[PDB]
Write a protein that holds these residues in place. Structure first.
Motif, short mmCIF file in Angstrom:
data_model
loop_
_atom_site.label_atom_id
_atom_site.label_comp_id
_atom_site.label_asym_id
_atom_site.label_seq_id
_atom_site.Cartn_x
_atom_site.Cartn_y
_atom_site.Cartn_z
N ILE A 81 0.86 -1.18 0.00
CA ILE A 81 0.00 0.00 0.00
C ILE A 81 0.89 1.23 0.00
CG2 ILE A 81 -1.81 1.26 1.25
CD1 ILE A 81 -2.49 -1.51 2.58
N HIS A 82 0.67 2.14 -0.94
CA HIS A 82 1.59 3.27 -1.05
C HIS A 82 0.87 4.50 -1.58
CE1 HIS A 82 1.67 0.94 -4.80
NE2 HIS A 82 1.64 2.13 -5.37
N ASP A 83 1.55 5.63 -1.44
CA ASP A 83 1.11 6.91 -1.96
C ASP A 83 1.92 7.23 -3.21
OD1 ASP A 83 3.63 7.60 -0.91
OD2 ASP A 83 2.83 9.13 0.46
N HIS A 84 1.70 8.42 -3.77
CA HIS A 84 2.35 8.80 -5.01
C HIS A 84 2.92 10.21 -4.93
CE1 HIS A 84 -0.28 5.45 -5.90
NE2 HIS A 84 0.64 5.12 -6.78
N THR A 85 3.32 10.64 -3.73
CA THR A 85 4.22 11.77 -3.55
C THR A 85 3.77 12.98 -4.36
OG1 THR A 85 5.91 10.07 -3.32
CG2 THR A 85 6.69 12.36 -3.37
N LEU A 135 -4.79 6.08 -1.20
CA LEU A 135 -3.64 5.19 -1.35
C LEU A 135 -4.06 3.98 -2.16
CD1 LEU A 135 -2.72 5.27 2.39
CD2 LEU A 135 -1.62 6.62 0.59
N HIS A 136 -3.08 3.23 -2.67
CA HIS A 136 -3.53 1.98 -3.25
C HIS A 136 -2.48 0.89 -3.18
CE1 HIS A 136 -2.21 2.52 -7.79
NE2 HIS A 136 -1.18 2.47 -6.97
N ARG A 137 -2.97 -0.32 -3.40
CA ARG A 137 -2.16 -1.52 -3.59
C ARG A 137 -2.56 -2.11 -4.93
NH1 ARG A 137 -3.27 -5.27 1.12
NH2 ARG A 137 -5.27 -5.73 0.10
N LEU A 152 2.70 6.30 -15.95
CA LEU A 152 3.15 7.68 -16.19
C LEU A 152 2.97 8.50 -14.93
CD1 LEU A 152 2.92 9.91 -19.26
CD2 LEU A 152 2.43 10.89 -17.01
N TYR A 153 4.08 9.03 -14.42
CA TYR A 153 4.05 9.86 -13.20
C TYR A 153 4.50 11.27 -13.55
CZ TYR A 153 3.23 5.45 -11.09
OH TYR A 153 2.65 4.24 -10.76
N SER A 154 3.78 12.27 -13.06
CA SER A 154 4.10 13.66 -13.35
C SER A 154 3.74 14.57 -12.17
CB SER A 154 3.35 14.12 -14.60
OG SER A 154 3.62 15.48 -14.85
FE LIG Z 1 1.01 2.97 -7.32
#
Ligand SMILES: [Fe+2]
Length: 187
Positions: A81-85, A135-137, A152-154
């Motif tokens: 389980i994590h975030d995306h800053t 959050l997601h897993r 894709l992260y931005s």
């Molecule tokens: Fe993710």
């Protein structure tokens, strides 16, 4: 009327245009990523698997506006389980299927974490998340077949937090690349 990339190279070109400016139309990016029909011949050079955990394989640096990468999920592989800053985060299926479980944010008390949504991403589907969403897993639904996804992260980010489902407590994690541009990293 969605612009349809015919190849992964088309998609990258379009993404360079959509992220050139200050504003990013999330639903537009999402529809264009979804319209690309996954073609393994085009991305197999990035599909580098590991026996024990999923790998992150950098495809494009987006002129510093975004990172485009391919994640390879072995049989039964899943994330924490994590975030995306604080970034935009798009995830598109290239092969197989991922289950996405959305969680609420913990607060200061220690408590079992709460699921907010649960779904399987379909063939070629593009999902979207950011920290305001939750959050997601993510995990491969299959113990006999791999899954491959295009992320894709931005803005780009190389750290996030992982959360303990039993308590909500979190730890900072440094994310690493298994390969870049089809080349294995030192590791
Ligand atoms: Fe993710």
């Amino acid at each position: 009327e969605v612009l349809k990339p015919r190849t992964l190279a088309d998609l990258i070109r379009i993404l360079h245009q959509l992220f050139a400016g200050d504003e990013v139309n999330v639903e537009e990016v999402q529809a264009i990523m979804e319209a690309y029909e996954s073609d393994p011949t085009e991305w197999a050079m990035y599909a580098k698997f590991d026996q024990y955990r999923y790998t992150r394989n950098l495809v494009d640096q987006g002129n510093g506006k975004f990172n485009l990468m391919i994640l390879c999920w072995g049989e039964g592989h899943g994330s924490s389980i994590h975030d995306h800053t604080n970034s935009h985060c798009f995830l598109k299926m290239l092969q197989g299927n991922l289950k996405e479980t959305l969680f609420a944010w913990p607060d200061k008390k220690s408590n079992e974490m709460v699921k907010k949504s649960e779904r399987v991403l379909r063939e070629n589907q593009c999902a979207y998340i950011n920290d305001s969403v939750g959050l997601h897993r993510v995990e491969n639904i299959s113990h006999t077949e791999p899954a491959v996804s295009l992320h894709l992260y931005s803005p780009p980010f190389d750290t996030c937090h992982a959360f303990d489902q039993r308590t909500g407590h979190k730890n900072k994690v440094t994310m690493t690349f298994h390969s870049k541009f089809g080349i294995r990293t030192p590791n």
